[PDB]
Design a binder for this molecule. Sequence first.
Ligand SMILES: OC[C@@H]1CC2(CCOCC2)CN1c1ncnc2[nH]ccc12
Length: 167
Amino acid sequence: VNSFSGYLKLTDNVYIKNADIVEEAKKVKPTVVVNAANVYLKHGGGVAGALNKATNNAMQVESDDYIATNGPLKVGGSCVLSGHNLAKHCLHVVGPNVNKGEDIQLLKSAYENFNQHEVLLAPLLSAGIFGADPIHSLRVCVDTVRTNVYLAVFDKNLYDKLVSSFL
Ligand SMILES: OC[C@@H]1CC2(CCOCC2)CN1c1ncnc2[nH]ccc12
């Protein structure tokens, strides 16, 4: 039993809700919140911009030190950093950005990072400003993630469309 509330159950391990991931994180304080990161950890917009703003830029400060030491992530890769005031940890995961010409097959590799954590709050990788089809993102998620994932879907029309089209 966990403290996630109001989610629709899609499969044995995948749950979904229309929610602002920032407000969800602030309520639940999950062990892991997933960020829709880029390889440079520059949290300018989308989910990443929102989560960073909610940390008063502390996420960006920590991220800049991470990059200075380790260099950029790989597309499809991840790193674990602090969750600041939002969660215990933040798993920064880089899904392919279609608006950069990045390979969509890497989306499965991106979701594989979730399997290293028993429970996560997360957005749909590569959706929104990353330019991929959110219906496809949800499908790859369901077919790749085996741990317990609670998906927060921002757009209402996106959420109802995601539920009504789910196979
Ligand atoms: O789940 C991925 C979605 C996709 C998105 C861009 C395209 O469609 C509109 C929404 C932004 N994402 C978010 N999801 C949950 N919480 C969020 N907070 C701020 C953004 C955000």
